[PDB]
């Protein structure tokens, strides 16, 4: 099936998912000089006080921290969005080395990792319906650089032992995603896609300007995960990022001057 290798990685996905060569694919390089400030954009509203985390899963491609999305409990609104988007999961993309790992780039700079907080538009009733719509999802993307530790991340890092291999899950209740956010909510936004198969063109991307800092030790623990299942040959879960795609006929807008 699809993955990140030589024989099954991003450069192959188009055969099973021709939308890979579409008009609104993600990620992209953010050219900071050509992104235009849009005074009509709003402050982002990220309301995570009632978030209810449930479980953490190694899906063979990343790990997902899953939320209860059966009520408006952790919602994204404002910014470029019309209406209300409910948090379903977050995950990361990361590298084999600190010099790569992010999906978006900023003036071609690659960060060590990138956090995706995935939310679906409540007007479509559930996730699976939302991904069929051009305004179905809102993904908040946050860059990670290596430096100081992120205290709020440590709970995630320390459960990773228990979900080493593909298909393993663990209870992961009472985790507060507010501890993964930077100080500033300044952002760039553009219309794009999921960055993994099926590559659906359903996402309003909201990429924060300010990265969070994590320690080397934290990211090193990400890199101990496995793509493989239990008792299969070990293949470290690293470089689970799609490179930048053509911007085509899109504009990236900045929320800040
Ligand atoms: Co992602």
Any idea which residue has 């100081």 for tokens?
148
Strand partners, 243: none
User: What resolution, expressed in A, was reported for this entry?
Assistant: 1.2
As residues whose CB is below 5 A from the ion ligand 1, the structure lists 116
Say if residue 91 carries a ligand binding annotation: yes
Closest CA to 200 of 116, 133, 103: 133
Report CA(230)–ligand 1 centroid distance (Å). Answer: 24
Quickly list DSSP for 98-126: TT---SSEETTBPPSEEEEEEEEEGGGSS
Domain ranges of the chain: 1-257
CA distances from 187 to 98, 190, 210 (A): 23, 10, 8
Elucidated via: X-ray
Report CA(203)–ligand 1 centroid distance (Å). Answer: 11
Residue ranges of E strands in 28-175: 29-30, 36-37, 44-47, 53-58, 63-67, 75-78, 85-94, 105-106, 113-121, 137-146, 169-171
The answer to whether the peptide bond before residue 27 is cis (omega within 30 degrees of 0) is: yes
**DSSP code for 234:** P
Say if residue 33 carries a ligand binding annotation: no
Say if residue 195 carries a ligand binding annotation: yes
Closest CA to 79 of 186, 179, 212: 186
Strand partners, 236: 226
**DSSP code for 228:** S
CA distances from 239 to 26, 72, 114, 174 (A): 16, 34, 11, 29
Structure tokens at 180: 């993964």
Any idea which residue has 């780039």 for tokens?
105
Residues with active-site annotation = 61
Write down the CATH number for the domain with range 1-257.
3.10.200.10
Closest CA to 183 of 155, 205, 209: 209
Give the burial string for 223-240 (b: 16+ CB within 10 Å, else e): bebbbbeeeeeeeebbbb
């Amino acid at each position: 099936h699809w993955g990140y290798g030589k024989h099954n990685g991003p450069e192959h996905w188009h055969k099973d998912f021709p939308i890979a060569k579409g008009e609104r694919q993600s990620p992209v390089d953010i050219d900071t000089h050509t992104a235009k400030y849009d005074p009509s954009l709003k402050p982002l509203s990220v309301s995570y006080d009632q978030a209810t985390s449930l479980r953490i899963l190694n899906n063979g491609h990343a790990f997902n921290v899953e939320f209860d999305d059966s009520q408006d409990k952790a919602v994204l609104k404002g910014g470029p969005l019309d209406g209300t988007y409910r948090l379903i999961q977050f995950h990361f993309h990361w590298g084999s080395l600190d010099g790569q790992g992010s999906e978006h780039t900023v003036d071609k700079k690659k960060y060590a990792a990138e956090l995706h907080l995935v939310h679906w538009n409540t007007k479509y009733g559930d996730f699976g319906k939302a991904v069929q719509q051009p305004d179905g999802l809102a993904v908040l993307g946050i860059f990670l650089k290596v430096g100081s530790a992120k205290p709020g991340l440590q709970k995630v890092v320390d459960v990773l032992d228990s979900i080493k291999t593909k298909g393993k899950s663990a209870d992961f209740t009472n985790f507060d995603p507010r501890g993964l956010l930077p100080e500033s909510l300044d952002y760039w936004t553009y219309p794009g896609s999921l960055t993994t198969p099926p590559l659906l063109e359903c996402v309003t991307w909201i990429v924060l300007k300010e990265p969070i800092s994590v320690s080397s030790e934290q990211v090193l623990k990400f890199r101990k995960l496995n793509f493989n299942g239990e008792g299969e040959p070990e293949e470290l879960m690293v470089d689970n990022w799609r490179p930048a795609q053509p911007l085509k006929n899109r504009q990236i807008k900045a929320s800040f001057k």
